[PDB]
């Protein structure tokens, strides 16, 4: 089997995509935030506490004659970005794109944290990171991926963002007119959990390349390219005005800048994101400083290839027994 989702920007800054799912019997769509770095299922629900929905699409488990709730089962989890969300848990049939999962865990939120109220565009999240970071508690639960893999024609899936623009979640086969040139395949560790790999360097706009191994994840989840403080001084040197503010959390540029590319190298070959990935508009309203794309890691503790940089490229998650990633221009 395969299947294959259009993926949408929830805004014109492309901070997230969201991608439709179908959820229970009939179908009930929900637009869920595909997310490489983590690996809950996780739908606002009819048992979400109601000032905490505010626009969302909500899964309502009694009208899905497939629904089953899983009993003693909770879920609860902590994002990087310090946002949360806890409840209960359904099995239901969950199809992507025309792939259909039955049996899927479905956690049901009975809370949300306000970053996710106030995102009325995102109805959850579909975790495709490796299903040791479930948080389903007493027994964890597969991802949808980790569920459809034996199934599909192949063990993968593919994300191919678009900058300021939808683009497209494949499950099962490579869609070989999707990028240029060929796909590079590098080494995963899977010993966090995540789809962590080492990147071989980087380039600042037109300038020489650094050979330099940069260990971070890819992440679907993740808006910007957080890397370490060196590269991004490295970068933002290069911008006139540029600097880092305590006050606004990161790199600021002047609105009147015109961007340079970063380069990241993937073993012998080069993924280039041009300046304007880079720049995500003024800081608030009206403001002429603008928030940079390209921010330190520094107090994360890893790197994230977020966004900033996959929206770049055309990414193979390998499935296979031993995990590899690919990457392509496109």
């Known amino acids: 089997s395969t299947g294959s989702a259009t993926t949408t920007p929830i805004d014109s800054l492309d901070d997230?995509?969201?991608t439709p799912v179908q959820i229970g019997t009939p179908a009930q769509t929900?637009?869920?935030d595909f997310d490489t770095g983590s690996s809950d299922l996780w739908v606002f629900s009819s048992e979400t506490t109601a000032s905490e929905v505010d626009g969302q699409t909500i899964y309502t488990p009694s009208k899905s004659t497939t629904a089953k709730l899983l009993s003693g089962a909770t879920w609860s989890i902590s994002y990087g970005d310090g946002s949360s969300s806890s409840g209960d848990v359904y099995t239901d049939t969950v199809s992507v794109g025309g792939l259909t999962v039955t049996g899927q865990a479905v956690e049901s939120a009975k809370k949300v944290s306000s970053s996710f109220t106030e995102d009325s565009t995102i109805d959850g999240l579909l975790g495709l990171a490796f299903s040791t970071?479930?948080?389903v508690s007493p027994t964890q639960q597969k991802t949808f991926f980790d569920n459809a893999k034996a199934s599909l024609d192949s063990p993968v899936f593919t994300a191919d963002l678009g900058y300021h623009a939808p683009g497209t979640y494949n499950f099962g086969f490579i869609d070989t007119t999707a990028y240029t040139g060929s796909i590079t395949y590098t080494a995963?560790?899977?010993?966090?959990?995540?789809?962590?790999?080492t990147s071989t360097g980087y380039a600042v706009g037109s300038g020489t390349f650094?050979?330099?191994?940069i260990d971070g994840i890819a992440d679907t989840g993740t808006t910007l390219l957080y890397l370490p403080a060196t590269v991004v001084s490295a970068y933002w040197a290069q911008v006139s005005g540029a600097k880092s503010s305590s006050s606004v959390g990161g790199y600021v540029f002047p609105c009147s800048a015109t961007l340079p590319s970063f380069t990241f190298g993937v073993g012998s070959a080069r993924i280039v994101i041009p300046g304007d990935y880079i720049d995500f508009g003024p800081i608030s309203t009206g403001?002429?400083?603008c928030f940079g794309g390209i921010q330190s890691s520094a107090?994360?503790?890893?790197?994230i290839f977020g966004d900033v940089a996959l929206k770049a490229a055309f990414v193979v998650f390998n499935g296979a027994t031993t995990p590899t990633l690919g990457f392509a221009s496109k």
Do not use: D
Not at 188 to 197: A, L, P, R
Not at 210 to 213: D, F, P
């Open 133 to 135: 970071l479930n948080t």
């Open 287 to 289: 403001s002429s400083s």
């Open 16 to 18: 997230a995509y969201i």
């Open 30 to 32: 929900l637009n869920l």
């Open 188 to 197: 995963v560790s899977t010993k966090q959990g995540f789809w962590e790999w």
């Open 210 to 213: 650094k050979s330099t191994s």
């Open 299 to 303: 107090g994360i503790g890893i790197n």
